[PDB]
Amino acid sequence: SEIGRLNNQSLLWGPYRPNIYFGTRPRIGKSLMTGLMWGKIESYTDFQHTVRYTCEQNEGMKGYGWDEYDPRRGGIQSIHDIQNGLDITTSFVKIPGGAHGGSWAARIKGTLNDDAPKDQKTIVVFYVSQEGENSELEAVPSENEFGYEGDVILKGRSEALGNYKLVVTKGKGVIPQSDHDLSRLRGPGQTVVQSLTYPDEVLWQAKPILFQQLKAGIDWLVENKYDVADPPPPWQVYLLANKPGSGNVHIVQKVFEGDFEFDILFSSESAGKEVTSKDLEREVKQATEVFGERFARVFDLKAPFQGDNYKKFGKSMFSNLIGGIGYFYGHSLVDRSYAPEYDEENEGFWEDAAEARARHQEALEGPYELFTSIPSRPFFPRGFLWDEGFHLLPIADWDIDLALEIIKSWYNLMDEDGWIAREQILGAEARSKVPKEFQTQYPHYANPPTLFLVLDNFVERLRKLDETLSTASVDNPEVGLEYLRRLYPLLRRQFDWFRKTQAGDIKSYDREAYSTKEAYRWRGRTVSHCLTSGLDDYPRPQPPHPGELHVDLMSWVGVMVKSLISIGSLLGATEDVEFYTKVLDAIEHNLDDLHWSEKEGCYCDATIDEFEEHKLVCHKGYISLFPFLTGLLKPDSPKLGKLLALIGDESELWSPYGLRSLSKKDEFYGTAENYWRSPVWININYLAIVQLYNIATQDGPYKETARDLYTRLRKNIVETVYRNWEETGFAWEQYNPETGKGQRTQHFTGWTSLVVKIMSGHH
Ligand SMILES: OC[C@@H]1[C@@H](O)[C@H](O)[C@@H](O)CN1CCCCCCNc1cc(-c2cccnn2)cc(C2CC2)c1
């Protein structure tokens, strides 16, 4: 409880809006939020096209991301904007104190690059909103006639934050001056503030709100006879009339000519004295020092990646992953019809389920909150369930208490049945980035339970103030156990939910196997896809069939039982632990009985024939390796040995750039959208690397084969992601096994960041 409050207080504030370039919000649904906008202005019509706010990635943006980051302390982001001729730095720092989650400060620095006109005009906006019924926020008016010569102070209060002040400092840089007539009514040019109110639920719509203000300014020009015969300069046409006051929205606008910088200082009143700029500079310097010392300990890169080039790389991949952390809040779109069509018990079920979907019974429910890292700032900045399992593996190394918060956050979404939606789209802001057709979540749709892998890591660590807090759940064995005590029932709920909702059919067919009980089938497959497995278009039995069994799914259930054995034990859930043991033992047998192909030398999914018999359907690739990847096979297993041969075999899976998702010998290799049908994916390569190492560091017949494969695969995977990063500045979603090129999505940090841990080794 004491550790709990110290964690809460520690993690409350951050730049938890990874969907925008730079903004802040605390981990409270309805509260104070800030966000940055900037754009060059060269004409009367360009600013609407140049202005930056929500993250994107196109030819106008060289790249962006976190150089250093730690959600407890803060960090530094670099933004390389080609369109706007600007290299921007955003430094953010947290200053503990008081009773309301502390203070914070940020510095916004813009440096024109060599290509930009030295006299560029850049509009900068700091947009501040506050949601809540009994809360207040007011801009203190300036002394000067038409705007502010120096600092802008907002005073506010709420129940969550108590009293606070938020200051936007004068900053440094040339502020352009207009000789136009308009300057008699609008000033020659200066910082301005508009203070406004809108219904709370739209405050997130910062760009439209700003533009509506800009447009009203222009309408006033037109009305008041400022015209094309003699027009004010663009930057002055686009500078709002100063109108500070009280409201739930405050727009702070500046125009700078040339290079600029300014500070934002949030001062919690319950803390000591207020935050100054000199405080900002010191806390930033200190944060870097600490970041440096922790990285070197937690991620000590081993040969042959000990060099500085690899260090910078690891720092980038890590900082982007942990820097993705957001806080999301709002309603989600869910079909709670539980239409019987979703049971998928008939042949041709996909058409039935489509019919049900076409009823559109989904409705908004919640609100929910989620504190999570994310795969992709520009393209999908939101929680994905099996992704988060991988994200937290390096995060847990860094700060186990952080990882546990995020696990806890995820589990608090689970409904009464044991279901967590695979994709968390929370609130109208998150929804804006997502077509309607893809918002709806389905209570029968699972996703791999990869969060158990993180739990497994914590368990091993448990058995063997920002520095202290990071590791309080391991350094106090009782803290750890209580966490496990409270989560355990939800883990069990999820286990049972898998076995209720994703059950395969043994008893109803000509099917023999050691267990009558253990068989699984992912719900939600279409003719070409199986989105729930995580391996979108990996080839599965055709056509899809209520008789299908999926070897990956059963392996995940294996992962789950094993975790439950260890957690069950620690809590002395004797009766539970006996039941799990029997489940484990049956999965071990049934994987062989239902999924092993002796003819093919690997595991395979299964269906039933035109003639009602169990047929194996083998497509050599990631799926085929699943019992090995999930840690389920004995190190002396002949089956394992056969998979090692498949893994190392260049004509099948082994490319110079890592393991191919699908074999070059498979008929579906490089077909269709070719998503999981040949490319190299880091998440699955990471599981391979870890399992190879496990076998390499243990007595057995495959020790030396495993050592060789581990050595090379680690090399191949790290070097592929490193070369791509070096060339392009990006982590990529997947890598081309023929060319080694990164392809699909950039800014995928994202499980590609697992490469930090691969380099650091010592599993
Ligand atoms: O990592 C999560 C999952 C994993 O769980 C799965 O295992 C894995 O199979 C797929 N990934 C990703 C699945 C995300 C589906 C939604 C993406 N929609 C989207 C794509 C792009 C885009 C632009 C350019 C190039 N390509 N794409 C742009 C937008 C826009 C805001 C405008 C949205």
Side-chain angles (χ1 to χ4, degrees), residues 1-4 6-58 60-142 146-158 160-171 173-183 185-272 274-277 279-288 290-292 294-415 417-436 438-459 461-462 465-466 468-477 479-506 508-509 511 513-516 518-574 576-581 583-598 600-609 611-612 614 616-633 635-698 700-703 705-761 763:
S1 273
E2 191 31 40
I3 299 297
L6 294 169
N7 252 290
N8 246 80
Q9 284 288 281
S10 185
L11 287 173
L12 194 101
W13 272 104
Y16 291 139
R17 315 192 54 191
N19 52 299
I20 61 175
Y21 289 116
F22 182 80
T24 66
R25 71 184 296 187
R27 310 211 274 152
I28 303 142
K30 285 154 167 206
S31 195
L32 181 70
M33 296 212 300
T34 69
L36 176 62
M37 307 188 214
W38 72 93
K40 72 194 183 178
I41 177 161
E42 271 168 339
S43 77
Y44 296 98
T45 63
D46 67 328
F47 179 61
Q48 74 197 126
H49 303 120
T50 64
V51 64
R52 295 296 191 195
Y53 179 61
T54 65
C55 299
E56 295 172 336
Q57 189 40 59
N58 55 41
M61 185 76 39
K62 181 176 150 130
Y64 56 90
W66 294 89
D67 305 325
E68 285 152 35
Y69 182 80
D70 183 311
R72 291 170 197 290
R73 282 300 268 281
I76 312 169
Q77 176 187 225
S78 288
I79 305 171
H80 301 297
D81 183 345
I82 299 162
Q83 201 192 178
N84 289 301
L86 270 164
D87 305 302
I88 303 166
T89 294
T90 57
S91 295
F92 169 78
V93 81
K94 276 162 81 173
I95 312 167
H100 296 102
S103 294
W104 58 264
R107 173 160 293 177
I108 313 299
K109 186 151 174 183
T111 310
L112 287 175
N113 66 26
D114 294 321
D115 294 316
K118 266 202 189 69
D119 68 343
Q120 179 160 116
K121 281 138 212 105
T122 299
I123 296 176
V124 191
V125 167
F126 201 71
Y127 177 100
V128 179
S129 65
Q130 193 176 49
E131 295 151 72
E133 276 180 332
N134 301 327
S135 62
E136 51 189 8
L137 185 63
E138 177 171 20
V140 185
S142 64
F146 301 109
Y148 294 69
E149 284 318 288
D151 294 359
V152 161
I153 301 145
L154 314 177
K155 281 174 145 82
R157 182 202 58 75
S158 74
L161 301 178
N163 289 292
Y164 62 85
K165 66 150 58 194
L166 175 41
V167 174
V168 185
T169 75
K170 163 188 180 49
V174 165
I175 130 87
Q177 297 289 276
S178 174
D179 208 23
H180 201 275
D181 245 283
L182 185 51
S183 308
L185 304 165
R186 287 279 207 58
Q190 59 286 324
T191 304
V192 297
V193 176
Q194 284 189 181
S195 295
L196 313 182
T197 53
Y198 271 102
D200 297 36
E201 68 199 63
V202 299
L203 292 200
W204 68 268
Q205 305 198 219
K207 194 175 153 174
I209 282 180
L210 158 65
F211 271 85
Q212 210 57 43
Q213 292 314 283
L214 298 172
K215 277 177 217 150
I218 297 169
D219 289 339
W220 183 99
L221 293 192
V222 171
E223 163 87 351
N224 285 255
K225 320 300 200 185
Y226 301 91
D227 58 40
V228 302
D230 174 26
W235 67 257
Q236 188 184 37
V237 166
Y238 277 79
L239 183 64
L240 296 171
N242 190 52
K243 255 111 126 229
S246 72
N248 65 8
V249 178
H250 303 264
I251 303 178
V252 187
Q253 188 185 19
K254 297 177 174 292
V255 192
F256 290 106
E257 164 172 347
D259 297 331
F260 61 80
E261 69 170 85
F262 64 87
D263 290 355
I264 302 120
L265 311 164
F266 181 86
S267 285
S268 193
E269 192 201 79
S270 86
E274 67 172 53
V275 175
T276 68
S277 297
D279 286 333
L280 161 50
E281 284 163 24
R282 166 211 330 115
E283 292 302 292
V284 160
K285 270 301 289 254
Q286 164 70 185
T288 304
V290 168
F291 186 88
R294 175 93 58 88
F295 191 93
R297 266 196 339 282
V298 167
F299 299 121
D300 165 69
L301 309 194
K302 290 165 186 198
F305 304 117
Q306 336 89 281
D308 278 359
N309 61 318
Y310 289 106
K311 209 145 79 24
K312 257 206 192 51
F313 161 64
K315 273 184 193 174
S316 180
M317 298 297 297
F318 176 72
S319 296
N320 275 309
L321 164 76
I322 185 170
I325 283 177
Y327 175 80
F328 305 85
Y329 174 86
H331 292 257
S332 282
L333 188 61
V334 180
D335 184 332
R336 297 280 181 182
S337 66
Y338 302 87
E341 291 82 358
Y342 296 149
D343 297 323
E344 301 181 343
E345 294 284 20
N346 287 338
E347 300 204 15
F349 57 78
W350 56 94
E351 296 160 330
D352 300 312
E355 280 187 42
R357 285 196 303 277
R359 288 176 203 151
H360 291 119
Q361 297 300 107
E362 59 273 9
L364 291 157
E365 62 183 59
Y368 298 105
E369 78 183 13
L370 184 54
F371 194 50
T372 188
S373 64
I374 59 160
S376 175
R377 286 184 59 196
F379 306 116
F380 29 98
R382 61 185 166 275
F384 286 71
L385 184 50
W386 91 303
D387 294 50
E388 195 66 11
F390 292 105
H391 295 159
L392 290 176
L393 293 168
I395 287 177
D397 289 0
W398 184 262
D399 189 319
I400 183 58
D401 276 64
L402 176 61
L404 296 168
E405 265 291 318
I406 294 170
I407 294 174
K408 190 186 91 223
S409 193
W410 269 96
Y411 278 85
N412 279 335
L413 293 170
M414 171 173 40
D415 77 5
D417 293 334
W419 172 65
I420 301 161
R422 57 187 272 241
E423 184 182 352
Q424 291 293 153
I425 308 165
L426 301 194
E429 191 189 21
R431 275 197 297 291
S432 64
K433 267 257 144 165
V434 181
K436 282 68 70 197
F438 304 119
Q439 299 165 9
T440 298
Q441 302 305 293
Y442 297 92
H444 57 122
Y445 280 9
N447 212 35
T450 54
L451 287 164
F452 284 81
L453 296 185
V454 188
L455 287 167
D456 293 332
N457 274 6
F458 169 56
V459 160
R461 271 166 81 174
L462 196 45
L465 190 90
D466 296 313
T468 322
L469 250 170
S470 74
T471 61
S473 281
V474 289
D475 297 348
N476 304 239
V479 179
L481 212 82
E482 190 46 36
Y483 175 93
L484 287 183
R485 184 168 289 110
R486 290 204 229 172
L487 184 70
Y488 176 74
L490 305 173
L491 301 186
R492 181 188 50 221
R493 202 184 309 168
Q494 191 171 45
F495 171 82
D496 285 328
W497 175 90
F498 265 94
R499 295 150 64 74
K500 184 70 269 271
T501 59
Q502 322 286 317
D505 195 346
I506 296 167
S508 133
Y509 292 112
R511 249 175 194 156
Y514 170 95
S515 173
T516 72
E518 295 300 316
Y520 301 95
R521 176 178 67 93
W522 297 107
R523 301 286 126 117
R525 76 164 286 241
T526 65
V527 163
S528 293
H529 295 93
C530 176
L531 299 195
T532 63
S533 60
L535 292 90
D536 296 16
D537 63 349
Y538 191 98
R540 299 287 190 167
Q542 290 309 305
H545 189 291
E548 287 178 67
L549 303 180
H550 304 308
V551 53
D552 57 322
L553 179 36
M554 182 169 287
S555 314
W556 287 121
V557 177
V559 178
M560 279 173 112
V561 251
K562 286 180 73 186
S563 284
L564 285 186
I565 280 139
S566 332
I567 302 164
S569 281
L570 260 59
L571 292 182
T574 290
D576 275 348
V577 166
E578 277 170 38
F579 181 76
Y580 304 149
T581 302
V583 178
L584 178 45
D585 149 80
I587 289 175
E588 287 166 350
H589 295 268
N590 272 31
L591 279 165
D592 301 354
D593 296 345
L594 285 161
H595 289 294
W596 177 266
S597 182
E598 258 293 318
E600 288 304 342
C602 58
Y603 299 91
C604 313
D605 286 341
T607 359
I608 90 133
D609 275 312
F611 312 83
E612 313 295 336
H614 167 97
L616 288 194
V617 186
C618 307
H619 293 290
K620 295 189 186 229
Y622 293 166
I623 290 303
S624 315
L625 307 175
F626 252 81
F628 165 64
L629 297 166
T630 54
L632 296 192
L633 296 187
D636 52 59
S637 162
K639 292 171 179 64
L640 165 60
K642 270 138 153 300
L643 295 177
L644 287 182
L646 178 56
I647 284 172
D649 176 354
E650 179 280 328
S651 67
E652 300 265 11
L653 298 203
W654 182 283
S655 83
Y657 310 95
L659 301 188
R660 313 183 184 85
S661 53
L662 192 53
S663 170
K664 310 188 294 179
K665 283 171 169 162
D666 186 85
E667 65 177 306
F668 292 101
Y669 187 82
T671 59
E673 305 161 293
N674 186 45
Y675 200 20
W676 289 84
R677 286 191 178 182
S678 67
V680 171
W681 291 81
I682 311 300
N683 69 333
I684 303 303
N685 277 266
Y686 172 93
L687 290 183
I689 285 173
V690 160
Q691 294 295 334
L692 279 171
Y693 181 76
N694 181 55
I695 296 151
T697 54
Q698 264 196 225
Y702 306 118
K703 198 213 227 285
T705 324
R707 160 69 57 189
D708 177 69
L709 296 169
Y710 163 81
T711 301
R712 288 161 55 198
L713 184 56
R714 169 162 174 278
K715 269 154 86 172
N716 295 352
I717 286 296
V718 169
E719 188 84 333
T720 304
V721 179
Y722 168 77
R723 275 288 146 229
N724 280 284
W725 176 87
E726 189 57 71
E727 279 178 69
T728 63
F730 298 122
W732 295 80
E733 191 168 349
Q734 62 168 214
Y735 297 82
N736 192 111
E738 177 198 307
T739 70
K741 264 143 179 207
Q743 49 176 226
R744 294 306 172 126
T745 247
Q746 316 92 316
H747 294 274
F748 195 77
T749 62
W751 59 49
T752 290
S753 284
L754 277 164
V755 85
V756 178
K757 270 263 268 175
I758 307 174
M759 287 195 293
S760 72
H763 313 284

